[PDB]
Symmetry: C5
Subunit: 310 residues, 5 copies
């Protein structure tokens, strides 16, 4: 095996698409190994630009191709460079722009915490012929920044592991484990936009539907509330435009369902007050005092989940 030392410099992270849980990473990858000594023009290292490395690979140079495991599509490699030293070490530098994908858990949607994962692996050479010594990730450009709505908290975590592939076991008897490099970058979602953009209008709608119980007109108790019901019902697919069609429920959908329950319970409660109007003149005060208990009890509904969920 030959040891390869990697250095990944993340230029920027952009285009975090939560619909299909893919993000876009731009950066540079440096892979340095050692070989037989060679002669170079002068004592300076020889620099081979793009569309000239293939001329050296044709002549017999050994340049492994390191692929990205969790990519979507293909990584768009731009300029690439090969630095050959007189002492006999080779440096393969390249620029990559890849749409990577990682599994995300959007339970706590407004207050989420995810991680962007970069997986690097040789395509053909296993650990018997290629090993990863170490990786230093230089996340200086996005160390503590906000990209679109995600804060990058802390540094990046690096891991070197061995992955056993069983589909190559029929062609390689006992050498089918490949060295894999994992780079994890923690990100925390910014809840401010949803706080002033959906939390406040939904809370205002819910408070307006709370304040409909004080009216002395029955038709205006029912029509305005119903309206508010129908608007909150129309607010159902807000999360499905941002995220995907998730099986679980998020905080925003939980408060939407809570608004459904509260407003429909108010509708059924005033209809049950009309049920209790046997003579049509009877007025309720103990069950219509919900004017005071309705808002508080609903408030409790959300906080309970809030605590249980975080």
């Amino acid at each position: 095996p030959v040891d390869v030392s990697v250095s990944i410099f993340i230029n920027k992270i952009y285009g975090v698409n939560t619909l299909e849980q893919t993000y876009k990473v731009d950066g540079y990858i440096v892979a340095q190994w050692t070989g037989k000594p060679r002669k170079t023009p002068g004592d300076k290292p020889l620099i081979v630009e793009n569309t000239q490395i293939e001329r050296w690979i044709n002549n017999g140079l050994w340049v492994p191709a390191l692929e990205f495991i969790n990519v979507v599509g293909s990584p768009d490699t731009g300029n690439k460079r090969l630095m050959l030293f007189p002492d006999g070490r080779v440096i393969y530098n390249a620029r990559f722009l890849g749409s990577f994908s990682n599994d995300m858990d959007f339970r706590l949607f407004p207050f989420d915490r995810q991680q962007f994962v970069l997986e690097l692996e040789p395509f053909s050479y296993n650990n018997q012929q290629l090993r990863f010594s170490d990786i230093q990730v230089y996340t200086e450009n996005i160390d503590n920044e906000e990209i679109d709505e995600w804060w990058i908290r802390g540094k990046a975590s690096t891991h070197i592991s061995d992955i056993r592939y069983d589909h190559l076991s029929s062609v390689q008897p006992n050498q089918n484990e490949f060295s894999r490099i994992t780079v994890r970058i923690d990100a925390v979602r910014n809840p401010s936009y949803y706080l002033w953009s959906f939390i406040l209008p939904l809370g205002l709608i819910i408070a307006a539907s709370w304040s409909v119980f004080w009216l002395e007109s029955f038709s205006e108790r029912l029509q305005t509330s119903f309206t508010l019901m129908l608007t909150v019902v129309a607010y159902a697919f807000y999360t499905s435009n941002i995220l995907g069609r998730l099986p679980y429920t998020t905080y925003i959908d939980q408060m939407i369902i809570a608004g459904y329950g509260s407003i429909f319970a108010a509708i059924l409660l005033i209809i049950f007050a009309h049920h209790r109007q046997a003579n049509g003149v009877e007025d309720d005060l103990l069950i219509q005092r919900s004017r005071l208990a309705f808002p508080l009890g609903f408030l409790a509904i959300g906080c309970v989940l809030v605590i249980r969920f975080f």
Copy 2:
């Protein structure tokens, strides 16, 4: 004919688009055959990376190109590798990322069960010159997982068949049958999102329109119901954003049409109660008792289909 043994390793399945019934498959394909013995450096097998296989094909090596039949666009082949053995066998390993298409039947839309199909076939060599011995599909990464909203149930089914092509009969007299490999992966749709996102709000709207019959105001019987009618009418094209413009009707559209029938029948029933108001003071109770029968009978409508359909 020369026998080719295939091994397809599905890295991940993502991007299941039901509008045009295409999904995206990432993975590795290994095709192993045997030939004349050759000399290699040392006793180890010789590994030929990408943009170096063509140099061997130019010199006279026999590397068939296996295409994907049911692809949309072209498969995006990334890194590719050729392993030549001293005993005289050749292994062609490649990474494919293809947008494949399969026919889907969205009758039971929330509780669907489809299959993802991968079809592999030589482009030029028929079964007289190329045969598929066996395929082992290594679906270990997606064995029992949820990808976006589809559960992968069970293992993958493999089939090797012969497809007779009639367009090559005018150029090949009696050898126009090609060996085809089919990989079927069963998937079951997760009904949870539609259960809490569309089933519950539509049921709440329908129950609210059921509870409008108890009012003692005629204008408020009609205006609120009509509203609920117009919202359920506005809920018509929900399925056409997820799936295509299907000729048949799904469960969601069936309950939407059932809501149309129930709510419009309530509208026509209260209008017919006003028809029976010859003196304008007559009140109905046998036909206005639908307050009790209306909800139940409607409930029956859906269950009947539910049973007949599953």
Copy 3:
């Protein structure tokens, strides 16, 4: 001139986009001609795969490039093959996936009948140097199937014609006519989706607005109708999401305009009934009997067009 015999096998037709009147065709194209006899390894025909045909073209082989005239973008050629025979005939087989475009007439939109047209033509060689003997279209995979919402009725029609190009007349004096091959595949749109998805809800809305004339409350005559007016007005741009911004009107837009006329005429009729209320107590029955004539006469409006249009 040298005669070229073509065989086009349509693998599948998908992605029929009516916004820009383009569809996507996948298939195989076989072009067979004859030349000088040559020597091949053994007596079997020699098969030349992709990225190896150019080596033969460099050495002096004559392989014409047949382009697609009505394509949008460029056809995505995948694998390609060249079969050379010892008797001296050449077969050029290729796989094409092209976004083709044809003019469509969406007058009868729900009950349309279009045709998918494939035009094939040599790029450089005219009929003095290249002629098309015959084309057999093998439409076996889509013979009688439904693709997305189009039924393929009957077989495919083939035509071989000569197209005179005037832009090459300044460089070629009397030889500027190119042989063109046209393949026409008839398709009929399935009206079922629009029948249960837009025909029925619009008919229900129109019937509900018909049934508003029986009310004994004037404000509830006007507000509900107006609403129904405003919803039918909001249903104007349904056709523009499916098709383009057509200059003519389709069946769906014709019934939308008919709903405009009927509902606005009902609005103006009840307002004119209020006009006739000089003392405010006068009630009309001859012009308010429209309760019976209104629905029928409107029904007549559509059928008349229906017959005139089909």
Copy 4:
């Protein structure tokens, strides 16, 4: 300088996107010049197909590359051909499919008149080394046709000019002027779709809001009008889906603002009638006679602009 004679044949014009003011042009470009006499096989001209011209350029042939100035992205050149004559003249024929961009003035949006502009220019050779003798544009396929919603009126105008580039002045002292070819194709927008799709529904809404002044119920004067106000307000961003976010106002937006002014003036007028109800029983007729003047005066508003604008 060497004179180059151009012939541009427009196959079709499609995909006119007014959001970013780009259209798509498919066609053929022929560039003919003369050089030293050469020997060809026989007396017929020699035809060099695609991926074979570069072999002649390597050997020393002079083939200039003519770029398109106003393109978006890069032009997708398909098949290309080089015709070499025994008398010593070279013809470069190519097929281009380019997304071109031109500045458009959407003041009169429904009744617009734009022009599609194709700009062709040598990339490197100035007028001291390359001149354009003449261009004949063969717009026979789209001479008098409708493409999507644009009529092509008249023929195409051709112009040959010299463009002085100042960024090449630091590297070329007195030779930095390049020969440019401009092709202008006049197009007139079809106003029919907007006439039956937005002009008529907006006019119907405005007429319905005109006819609300005849009611003898004050609450029904206000609620229905307000509704109509809110719908016309919701019709604000119709132009921004077709065109971009223009700084000026179009005819459709001008009539939308006119509907705002008319309907809000009716709202403020009936509220001012309630202002004049000091005793609550006073009824106005001179200022409430707007029933007659309101519709006419509004009609005048639009026509005035109509005339001033065209």
Copy 5:
């Protein structure tokens, strides 16, 4: 080090997408350096077109590749040219079309002022082997123009700096600083479209909700206002279609929240007037005089921010 003189000519700037803060730049880049003297055909400089420069790079010519740092994806280089002089200087001219990205601050959204930034840098050669002498930016085509909705004010600013890269420090001991060129083009957003398209309709809605306090009907005080509330609530996500999901609030969102506060305060104020109706006949005038103070005080709310923000 060898000095390289750059000249960037911006052909056009288009496609300013504020959702992901990327724009598209088309233009030409000229890089001129000097080397050893060489012999050319005649005394004229030798011009090497595209797909011929690589033949010179193979033979030993030194052509550095200058990349764009802030690009998204990869720059689409079209035609490229190499001008070699007899005195021994090399000019590399190229055409670039790149999707560049810059950080934007959408606080003052309708009255914004941003800058488009182009960053150019050698891929491999540091300042010890490649230096940038000067750059002249020829922004003559977009000097004082409006592109889509942005005015280009003033000229372009050029800067040459040194960027220290730490990821190359492990492979280069003390030479890891690269010469970088920054081009800044100031742009000012045109507020006219938002002035006539969203400022005026929102102001009209707010004024209509101001004018609801003058009614002598309580149900019509509440229902119309509520409606206006619900429409202004529905106007929440207007900014999120133009820009992204920003954490801060813009002017349009600030006035939307101000409309929320004003209209909901009017709703709570008329409900509190009903609270003060202990006998149900009491009418307020000091707190219901808001008819005069309500509009003015709200007006003040916006202006205060306006001044504090600009």
